[PDB]
Design an enzyme around this catalytic site. Structure first.
Site, PDB file in Angstrom:
ATOM      1  N   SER A 103      40.650 -75.924 -53.649  1.00  0.00           N
ATOM      2  CA  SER A 103      41.275 -74.875 -54.528  1.00  0.00           C
ATOM      3  C   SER A 103      39.967 -73.944 -55.336  1.00  0.00           C
ATOM      4  CB  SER A 103      42.372 -75.374 -55.387  1.00  0.00           C
ATOM      5  OG  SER A 103      42.539 -73.894 -56.064  1.00  0.00           O
ATOM      6  N   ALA A 104      39.030 -74.731 -55.796  1.00  0.00           N
ATOM      7  CA  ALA A 104      38.023 -74.275 -56.644  1.00  0.00           C
ATOM      8  C   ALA A 104      36.644 -74.221 -55.655  1.00  0.00           C
ATOM      9  CB  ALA A 104      37.518 -75.087 -57.655  1.00  0.00           C
ATOM     10  N   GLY A 105      36.602 -75.339 -54.325  1.00  0.00           N
ATOM     11  CA  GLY A 105      35.523 -75.171 -53.629  1.00  0.00           C
ATOM     12  C   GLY A 105      34.439 -76.050 -54.147  1.00  0.00           C
ATOM     13  N   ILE A 106      34.865 -77.126 -54.976  1.00  0.00           N
ATOM     14  CA  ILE A 106      33.950 -78.060 -55.602  1.00  0.00           C
ATOM     15  C   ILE A 106      34.032 -79.604 -55.302  1.00  0.00           C
ATOM     16  CG2 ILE A 106      32.867 -76.077 -56.792  1.00  0.00           C
ATOM     17  CD1 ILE A 106      34.036 -77.249 -59.464  1.00  0.00           C
ATOM     18  N   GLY A 107      35.494 -80.004 -55.617  1.00  0.00           N
ATOM     19  CA  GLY A 107      35.782 -81.423 -56.092  1.00  0.00           C
ATOM     20  C   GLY A 107      35.706 -82.034 -54.757  1.00  0.00           C
TER      21      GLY A 107
ATOM     22  N   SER B 203      36.134 -80.554 -51.694  1.00  0.00           N
ATOM     23  CA  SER B 203      34.881 -79.946 -50.773  1.00  0.00           C
ATOM     24  C   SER B 203      33.595 -80.597 -51.061  1.00  0.00           C
ATOM     25  CB  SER B 203      34.663 -78.451 -50.945  1.00  0.00           C
ATOM     26  OG  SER B 203      35.885 -77.824 -50.754  1.00  0.00           O
TER      27      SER B 203
ATOM     28  N   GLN C  62      34.426 -84.048 -58.433  1.00  0.00           N
ATOM     29  CA  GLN C  62      34.720 -83.645 -59.859  1.00  0.00           C
ATOM     30  C   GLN C  62      35.385 -84.685 -60.685  1.00  0.00           C
ATOM     31  OE1 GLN C  62      35.837 -80.386 -61.600  1.00  0.00           O
ATOM     32  NE2 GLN C  62      33.919 -80.534 -61.006  1.00  0.00           N
TER      33      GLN C  62
HETATM   34  C1  LIG Z   1      39.667 -79.559 -64.756  1.00  0.00           C
HETATM   35  N1  LIG Z   1      38.943 -78.303 -64.269  1.00  0.00           N
HETATM   36  C2  LIG Z   1      39.745 -77.101 -63.835  1.00  0.00           C
HETATM   37  O1  LIG Z   1      40.789 -77.253 -63.780  1.00  0.00           O
HETATM   38  C3  LIG Z   1      39.089 -76.217 -63.314  1.00  0.00           C
HETATM   39  C4  LIG Z   1      39.534 -75.526 -61.960  1.00  0.00           C
HETATM   40  C5  LIG Z   1      39.367 -76.526 -60.898  1.00  0.00           C
HETATM   41  C6  LIG Z   1      40.553 -76.485 -60.064  1.00  0.00           C
HETATM   42  C7  LIG Z   1      40.617 -77.330 -59.065  1.00  0.00           C
HETATM   43  C8  LIG Z   1      39.491 -78.237 -58.758  1.00  0.00           C
HETATM   44  N2  LIG Z   1      39.380 -79.134 -57.977  1.00  0.00           N
HETATM   45  S1  LIG Z   1      39.049 -78.649 -56.311  1.00  0.00           S
HETATM   46  O2  LIG Z   1      37.748 -78.328 -56.365  1.00  0.00           O
HETATM   47  O3  LIG Z   1      40.106 -77.814 -55.747  1.00  0.00           O
HETATM   48  O4  LIG Z   1      39.109 -79.981 -55.709  1.00  0.00           O
HETATM   49  C9  LIG Z   1      38.452 -78.223 -59.703  1.00  0.00           C
HETATM   50  C10 LIG Z   1      38.265 -77.430 -60.780  1.00  0.00           C
HETATM   51  C11 LIG Z   1      37.053 -77.251 -61.693  1.00  0.00           C
HETATM   52  N3  LIG Z   1      37.388 -76.372 -62.852  1.00  0.00           N
HETATM   53  C12 LIG Z   1      36.394 -76.358 -63.801  1.00  0.00           C
HETATM   54  O5  LIG Z   1      36.560 -75.770 -64.862  1.00  0.00           O
HETATM   55  C13 LIG Z   1      35.103 -76.754 -63.441  1.00  0.00           C
HETATM   56  C14 LIG Z   1      34.006 -76.670 -64.764  1.00  0.00           C
HETATM   57  C15 LIG Z   1      32.684 -77.381 -64.179  1.00  0.00           C
HETATM   58  C16 LIG Z   1      31.721 -76.527 -63.654  1.00  0.00           C
HETATM   59  C17 LIG Z   1      30.476 -76.984 -63.229  1.00  0.00           C
HETATM   60  C18 LIG Z   1      30.176 -78.415 -62.976  1.00  0.00           C
HETATM   61  C19 LIG Z   1      31.321 -79.306 -63.855  1.00  0.00           C
HETATM   62  C20 LIG Z   1      30.907 -80.752 -63.632  1.00  0.00           C
HETATM   63  O6  LIG Z   1      30.684 -81.038 -64.803  1.00  0.00           O
HETATM   64  O7  LIG Z   1      30.961 -81.585 -62.577  1.00  0.00           O
HETATM   65  C21 LIG Z   1      32.248 -78.734 -64.321  1.00  0.00           C
END
Ligand SMILES: CNC(=O)[C@@H]1Cc2ccc(NS(=O)(=O)O)cc2CN1C(=O)CCc1cccc(C(=O)O)c1
Ligand SMILES: [Cl-]
Ligand SMILES: [Cl-]
Ligand SMILES: [Cl-]
Ligand SMILES: [Cl-]
Ligand SMILES: [Mg+2]
EC number: 3.1.3.48
Length: 297
Positions: A215-219, A221, A261
């Site tokens: 969804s965000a392309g980080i966790g 992924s 994440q």
């Molecule tokens: C709980 N977080 C959220 O709902 C939002 C939006 C969101 C949705 C879904 C997510 N999971 S994913 O990437 O689809 O597997 C991750 C995130 C990351 N988010 C963020 O706000 C990321 C903020 C962030 C930005 C950069 C680095 C970090 C870190 O400390 O590892 C954290």
């Protein structure tokens, strides 16, 4: 060494602290393009943006912005494009990127609907007879076939550049049971899927970088790419002891923020790499065992 470290972290209960030190140590680079007013509706989440230095630029043709990053792993000699789940207005941009970057595979680690909300647009066709035309970017996308397993689906798609009539086959690898901020069911389930992507040839250096998204392309992924890169590194060297997983993650985080994440996703990455090492170092039989344990049929 990874297994020694794993056991020590586990025994001391310190996954949270190890994970927070990664967050603390991680690179912070500017994301000025992502933050331009004109790009607001191209970003799914306020706080997830590509760094300017590593963002993918679109080649058409008035706004080059997409929320996507090139993760260029120099030592491993593999690249990935990590991107958010496309939005209703960015699906044309997504396929434009796939075309321009010469990607053969797209790895999707989320569902369209998660926890009651729309976390990704329906960016590919679900039925052969209902192809998609992206008028903005002059592309057509047709579902050719699909192989539905219990927790993942592989699709064959045909992407056509309508400007030239060139067509390309794109493989879509859809992991349907990886919860957001969660982990795969087992190392086996994960590795069986990763090896499916690898067996397809989609990660070959003869193609453009695989596109990986959640969804965000980080966790999710980030978890996928970390495991893959670590396994590749040890494979090149035939030396599991040479791989420093936390260093590899910090290197990846030079290219996109927030990769991996949760602490348990980091823990899982270690489990996946340690398990996958058995195959890399020549116990061929483990691959079949993963298939069995994953209950894919
Ligand atoms: C709980 N977080 C959220 O709902 C939002 C939006 C969101 C949705 C879904 C997510 N999971 S994913 O990437 O689809 O597997 C991750 C995130 C990351 N988010 C963020 O706000 C990321 C903020 C962030 C930005 C950069 C680095 C970090 C870190 O400390 O590892 C954290
Ligand atoms: Cl879905
Ligand atoms: Cl739901
Ligand atoms: Cl959406
Ligand atoms: Cl979920
Ligand atoms: Mg039908």
């Amino acid at each position: 060494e990874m297994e020694k470290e794993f056991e020590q972290i586990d025994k001391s209960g310190s996954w949270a602290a190890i994970y927070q030190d990664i967050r603390h140590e991680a690179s912070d680079f500017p994301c000025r393009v992502a933050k331009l007013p004109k790009n607001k509706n191209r970003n799914r989440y306020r706080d997830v943006s590509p760094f300017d230095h590593s963002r993918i630029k679109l080649h058409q043709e008035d706004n080059d912005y997409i929320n996507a990053s090139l993760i260029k792993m120099e030592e491993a000699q593999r690249s990935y494009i990590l991107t958010q789940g496309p939005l209703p207005n960015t699906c044309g941009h997504f396929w434009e990127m796939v075309w321009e970057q010469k990607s053969r595979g797209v790895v999707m680690l989320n569902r369209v609907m998660e926890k009651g909300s729309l976390k990704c647009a329906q960016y590919w066709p679900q039925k052969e007879e209902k192809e998609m035309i992206f008028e903005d970017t002059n592309l057509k996308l047709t579902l050719i076939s699909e192989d539905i397993k219990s927790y993942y689906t592989v699709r064959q798609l045909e992407l056509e550049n309508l400007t030239t009539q060139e067509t390309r086959e794109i493989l879509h690898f859809h992991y349907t049971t990886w919860p957001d901020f969660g982990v795969p069911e087992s190392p086996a389930s994960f590795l069986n899927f990763l090896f499916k992507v690898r067996e397809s040839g989609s990660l070959s250096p003869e193609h453009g970088p695989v596109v990986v998204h959640c969804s965000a392309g980080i966790g999710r992924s980030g978890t996928f790419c970390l495991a893959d890169t670590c396994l590749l590194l040890m494979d090149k060297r035939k030396d599991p002891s040479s791989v420093d997983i936390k260093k590899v993650l910090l290197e990846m985080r030079k290219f996109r923020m927030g990769l991996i994440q949760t602490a348990d996703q980091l823990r899982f990455s270690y489990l996946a790499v340690i398990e996958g090492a058995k195959f890399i170092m020549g116990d061929s039989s483990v691959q079949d065992q993963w298939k069995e344990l994953s209950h894919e049929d």
